[PDB]
Design a protein around this ligand. Structure first.
Ligand SMILES: [Cl-]
Ligand SMILES: [Cl-]
Ligand SMILES: [Cl-]
Lengths: 76, 76, 74, 76
């Protein structure tokens, strides 16, 4: 299926994925298309920060859903 | 099977692939041989920009076929 | 299962893994979450430097276990 | 099984591999241990340059064998 990933600016990425794909898989896809490494990526859906090892279906992300992509900064 | 990947300059990458490999697989092989990240890679065949999720058979890429590899720049 | 990875400062990383995951798999997950390339990671558990090709179960790393992550130099 | 990788300097890398691993698999393991990207790696055994897609058993590389790791430079 197809999903969308948008930065807050509105720049849209289109990804082909499977419901069983993990959030990490999506992150690697964003890296493939955008050069943005996974550790710099925070993905948000339904107001929730998406966890790497959990799947798209787990979060009920469906055909043509849109995730937001947010930059993840260093802490300590 | 074997395929070729050429920059517009003529420089040739020879790859060992399967028809079920995806375009992303091929990009990864190109990274493996040339150090060029997938996100900087645009592959072209039959006039068409090749999509990461599609397979070589999907685009009728057969043995000894040549893809063109082109630099993808930052935009929006 | 869940495991923790901590630097010597105490900074804590939480990872979802399988007992059949290799030590290299774990380093790949650390890279995923922290951007530290596997070659720069040394992982230690039970005093032992952890070998890449061995599994978590090979080392009897169980759930809620903690590993130490240390910087590996040239 | 265990194999050894050495530069022409003696520095010895010890790898755990399977006879069905590809040469690319080995380069990936070298990257994991040393940070050397696969494209910068030329591996040599029995006087030949090893091909990414071929397997360790394909080259008759057995346990406790030693491969040579050689720098690959930019060319054309
Ligand atoms: Cl290849
Ligand atoms: Cl647990
Ligand atoms: Cl190894």
């Amino acid at each position: 299926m197809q999903i969308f990933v948008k930065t807050l600016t509105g720049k849209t990425i289109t990804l082909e994925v499977e419901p069983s794909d993990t959030i990490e898989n999506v992150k690697a896809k964003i890296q493939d298309k955008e050069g943005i490494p996974p550790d710099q990526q925070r993905l948000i859906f339904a107001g929730k920060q998406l966890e790497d090892g959990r799947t798209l279906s787990d979060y009920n992300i469906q055909k043509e859903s849109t995730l937001h992509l947010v930059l993840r900064l260093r802490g300590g």
